[PDB]
Design a protein around this ligand. Structure first.
Ligand SMILES: NC(=O)C1=CN([C@@H]2O[C@H](COP(=O)(O)OP(=O)(O)OC[C@H]3O[C@@H](n4cnc5c(N)ncnc54)[C@H](OP(=O)(O)O)[C@@H]3O)[C@@H](O)[C@H]2O)C=CC1
Ligand SMILES: NC(=O)C1=CN([C@@H]2O[C@H](COP(=O)(O)OP(=O)(O)OC[C@H]3O[C@@H](n4cnc5c(N)ncnc54)[C@H](OP(=O)(O)O)[C@@H]3O)[C@@H](O)[C@H]2O)C=CC1
Ligand SMILES: O=P(O)(O)OC[C@H]1O[C@@H](O)[C@H](O)[C@@H](O)[C@@H]1O
Lengths: 528, 527
């Protein structure tokens, strides 16, 4: 029609990832991607055992931001995908008094549902499953009325199986977890006639070894590890679960997955955004506690763990704790911090320019560190963990550099690379060196190419479905969490004591120049 | 003056249009071609070198040699004053009619380089003479030297490359007349001789022919050509094996379960049964091609990228191969196709009755060394089969734990014909929600380095490599001997009637005795 030329808005979406891969101007790449890029639009539109028992999902802190912005929207997308039972009942628990609960669902919630809102109004049928309960988190009596309301919905079930399953979501600060679980234990446990209870716990799981061990001990008398589901927003990503399969279902990758073949392993987490006006409470957490101690450590555990003896959930987790116990605590000389300042053009204000940050504080927004795994498989292999905010690019990936085959080709070849990227675009490719397809020459004419492999909810909604299915594979265990803290706690105390302090770097940079020097000094090689 | 300059290109336009009518099918296609050509074009060192092609009247000279040198000419890989002389016994009366028609009509491309072909043919001369005549070679050496001495450059004399596009029964006399009649100008220059396909038929036959040529040329001058070792993807076999740690670490017996080198053709003998009946499929494509491919696949790490270090290693691994015996081989002879398109092998008039010549052969070779002890190397070749296919199949040992039936053997596949390809088949988890860690599918990660454009043929490397004096992709004297010793005892047993081929109609994969043999020798089938 008139002025509707989104083909210009269309075209640079094609361009954005031709700069991401830049493969030898392959005309097939421009073509073969194009129809798959359009058939993204061509493919979208609006268990037999979970039906068997009534299910109740109780979201504590429904008034909270995480509950309204992704938690309830997560359950919405699971409903449209058919991943929730038809008689599921969702109850929001919060202290704030709200009347006209349909207005609360249709205004303060309906502000933050999925973009499929126009694709279909199944949400109106979804909101009929949502109820609101106002009460306290430390009141045993309030949870008994919650149990009464839940029982009036479990006994409203039309199936023959008795009881009901209760999934409790703690979208609350961790200081409230202990009292909430005590109130559940004393007042709102599942009916004796049948049903399980599972509790999802959100981060931060403490701030050090002593801090987190107290939290797990405060929840011990109420729920075991089969009932506690500490959620990780990255263990649901599809390539990080694929790490297990390519390692252990293929002899090719398994035979070279050791210190006798691998030169360097780097797990990097990059964001172009800063705290952006809300850094006052990131100032007390730091980059290490935010994404390094939990996310990158989880990825490292799957990358370096020994072969599980079965594909059961607790066999995989057993290997994760066993390999993490081979890691020495990180020292201050194996870590370089950073704190981002204002952008050169002034686009992104500096971290200290934030009103909410206490000026003069040394909280790190950037950190690169080396980890050592002392076992037969990984003795001597440098494991580099990198994480920073407000950097040159948005990037979460694994880079595995294999040791160079030196003698036959010399400077005509370089290190092999295995790369697994999860964000923004999923990919796994193996970079090796082949002979140039032009002519013969001296057989020393070579170029580094890559070997790219061919191929409903997001990562967050996968984990909730995993919890509803009883799969604890992608949730960190209590023993697993303690070992991770013991690795990082001695370093974190040095950070708080000022033994190492961040180096300033402008927004949009790769980070401090000392970070890249540290990376190249710990076994990493770059070719351009 | 300019008048003759505008009628030579009109002939040049003609020689492009004359090229296709003798190929295809009349007068309207010449017209419809002409309008294609109008804007087809309209859109916008050191020494003298002599290339002498003996047997220029032969089919190989006109069909594959001269088109080769033509394509390297447009690629700019020959000196500006290169000299090409066609040597043959047959009479030709018209000097340029032989050049402009019977050689240009095997050129390509027709329209975008047809005028470049005209300037290419100005480097080509024809010499009629005998292969055993000292006087004729002295006459040939005279005209060779008197274009060498007209060359303008710092060095003297020139280099001479000899292409023997002749039956092997003439090689001994041709090389003798060169040695005493046409050696390079003594002031300076080298001589290199290309020897075409049929190097004997067993160890004894090949030992006599190579002994018949040593008193004239050493191994640095003798370039025994295999038009598979200039291939793009078997010449890369060396690079991926040794320039990459990932492929080198699994290139042994503890990671590889079965290796298959296969050669498939939909064509039959095609009315030429009298000349394939005395050769056999083993002597044609297996003793030479697949063994050469086997050498590159199984050779140890060379000490350097030097020519004779690569050839030494491919010689050394062949010496670990025990001679093939009859019980590790299954033969086949193709009969008439089901649809009747391809006649049976015995239905040829030129085929003697009751012939047991094999048109199909699958065999297992055992490489007894540390790297390959116990690994079955299966070589398969056959004519008139289901598809045209030349590929390598490397099946890695399956890792059962912890996936069991959720995974299978990894596969590394190298294809060279019809389309070159290279992919590794692996099992990953299916991208799916309730498809859990046990839900997997077989995917692949292919050699996705294509270019903007995309194409020389295998020869054009070999002549160029001969021109550069590489010799890495040419069969050496010792290499040819050890390869013959592997196959000759089996060839004699077939000659003695110990083994007789199993019939199979044209268009099938072959007899099931082949597929039973393949499945019983370490191969596994997925779906
Ligand atoms: N949303 C996000 O982007 C991020 C979320 N997280 C984690 O998710 C969890 C929940 O997210 P979020 O909603 O933002 O957290 P909030 O601080 O906003 O608390 C959520 C709700 O719980 C109640 N609440 C707040 N403080 C207290 C308190 N001391 N005691 C009892 N109740 C309180 C409030 O509801 P009411 O007053 O009605 O009871 C509030 O609306 C957090 O633990 C956080 O660490 C981690 C990284 C990013
Ligand atoms: N044609 C093909 O597709 C293939 C060919 N080869 C091999 O290359 C060699 C040449 O190929 P091709 O042209 O087909 O073979 P030919 O039988 O056609 O001989 C080639 C030329 O050499 C001369 N010639 C033939 N027989 C004799 C003889 N007893 N004595 C002297 N000269 C002879 C003839 O030229 P003149 O009479 O003028 O002297 C003939 O034109 C062969 O050995 C062949 O096996 C290798 C791969 C494929
Ligand atoms: O063995 P054949 O059938 O002659 O095939 C050889 C040709 O096959 C083609 O695919 C290649 O591009 C050429 O390099 C090669 O010369």
């Amino acid at each position: 029609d008139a002025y509707v030329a989104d083909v210009d808005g269309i075209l640079d979406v094609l361009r954005a990832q031709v700069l991401e891969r830049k493969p030898d101007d392959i005309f097939q790449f421009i073509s073969k991607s194009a129809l798959s890029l359009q058939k993204d639009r061509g493919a979208e539109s609006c268990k037999d055992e979970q039906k068997s028992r009534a299910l109740t999902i109780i979201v504590f802190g429904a008034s909270g931001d995480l509950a309204k912005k992704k938690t309830f929207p997560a359950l919405f997308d699971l409903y449209c995908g058919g991943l929730l039972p038809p008689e599921v009942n969702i109850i929001g628990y919060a202290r704030t008094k709200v009347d006209d609960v349909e207005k609360w669902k249709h205004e303060t919630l309906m502000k933050y549902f999925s973009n499929l809102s126009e694709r279909g109004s199944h949400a109106e049928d979804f909101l009929k499953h949502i109820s609101y309960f106002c009460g306290a988190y430390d009141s045993v009596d309030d949870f008994k009325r919650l149990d009464a309301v839940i029982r009036e919905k479990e006994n409203a079930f039309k199936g023959p199986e008795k009881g009901g399953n209760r999934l409790f979501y703690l979208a609350l600060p961790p200081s409230v977890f202990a009292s909430v679980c005590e109130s559940i234990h004393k007042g709102a446990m599942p009916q004796e006639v049948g049903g399980w209870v599972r509790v999802i716990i959100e981060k931060p799981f403490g701030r050090d070894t002593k801090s987190s061990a107290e939290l797990s001990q405060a929840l011990e008398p109420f729920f075991d590890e089969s009932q506690l589901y500490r959620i990780d927003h990255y263990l649901g990503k599809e390539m990080v679960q694929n790490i297990i399969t390519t390692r252990f279902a293929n002899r090719i990758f398994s035979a070279v997955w050791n210190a006798s073949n691998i030169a360097c392993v780097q797990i990097t987490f990059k964001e172009t955004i800063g705290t952006e006006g809300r850094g006052g409470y990131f100032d007390n957490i730091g980059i290490i506690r935010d994404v390094m101690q939990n996310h990158l450590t989880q990825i490292l555990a799957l990358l370096a763990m020994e072969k599980p003896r079965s594909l059961d959930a607790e066999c995989i987790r057993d290997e994760k704790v066993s390999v993490l116990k081979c890691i020495e605590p990180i020292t201050k000389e194996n870590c370089v911090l950073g704190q981002y300042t204002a952008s050169a053009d002034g686009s992104i204000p500096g971290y200290l320019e934030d009103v909410t940050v206490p000026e003069g504080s040394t909280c790190p927004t950037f950190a690169v560190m080396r980890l050592n795994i002392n076992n037969d498989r990984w003795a001597g292999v440098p494991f580099i963990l990198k994480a920073g905010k407000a950097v040159e690019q948005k990037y979460v990936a694994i880079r595995i550099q294999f040791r160079d085959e030196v003698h036959p080709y010399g400077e005509a070849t370089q290190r092999n690379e295995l790369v697994i990227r999860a964000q923004p675009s999923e990919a796994m490719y193996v970079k090796i060196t082949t002979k140039v397809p032009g002519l013969s020459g001296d057989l020393r004419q070579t170029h580094q190419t890559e070997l790219d492999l061919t191929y409903l909810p997001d990562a967050y909604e996968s984990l909730i479905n995993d919890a509803l299915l009883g799969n604890s594979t992608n949730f960190v265990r209590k023993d697993e969490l303690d070992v991770a803290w013991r690795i990082f706690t001695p370093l974190l105390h040095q950070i708080d004591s000022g033994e190492i302090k961040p180096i300033p770097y402008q927004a949009g940079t790769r980070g401090p120049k000392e970070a890249d020097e540290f990376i190249a000094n710990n076994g990493f090689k770059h070719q351009k």
